[PDB]
Amino acid sequence: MNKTDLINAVAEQADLTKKEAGSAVDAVFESIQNSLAKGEKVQLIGFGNFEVRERAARKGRNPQTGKEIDIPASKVPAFKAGKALKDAVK
Amino acid sequence: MNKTDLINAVAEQADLTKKEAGSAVDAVFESIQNSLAKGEKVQLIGFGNFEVRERAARKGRNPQTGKEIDIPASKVPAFKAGKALKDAVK
Q1: CATH number for position A1
Q2: What role is this protein assigned (chains A, B)?
Q3: Backbone angles phi, psi at A53, to 5 degrees
Q4: What is the domain range of residue A32?
Q5: Residue among B10, B30, B77 minimizing CB distance to A28
Q6: Are strands A74-81 and A68-71 parallel, antiparallel or unpaired?
Q7: Cα torsion at B6, B9, B12, B15 (round to 10°)?
């Protein structure tokens, strides 16, 4: 499934023009983006959650090379699937 | 942001009724779930990807039997953020 397939499903199931469904779909991904960007967890009952994971600035060791490196702090997107989604896939 | 906040954000940005936005949001999440349930990867340009991740079947050991057991393969949902969503959180 790509973004166009997604837009099409939305057009039917919600009864919108492909133009409208496209905006809705743009809006969903945009809304979510803007929420993680401001650090807000997105909790979607039934589906799952999108969170921002904080990684602390620390001393590390470069994986399979082994030198002591300096690791800057970081913020990365992360998704926690809910029960309904886990079950669907098992 | 919860699902209700999401629907309202979508209503605003796509200029649609709460009914239209509610149906769209439901449509996006039922679509993504149905695709993973069929084992289909979901590829969303800009946003990210939802995949069915294979966890390999491997060997284990029963502490109270002492025999080598088979721990079966498993499948779990997963999200790979795209450049745009990753960039937003940094």
Answers
A1: 4.10.520.10
A2: Histone-like DNA-binding protein which is capable of wrapping DNA to stabilize it, and thus to prevent its denaturation under extreme environmental conditions.
A3: -95, 125
A4: 1-90
A5: B10
A6: unpaired
A7: -40
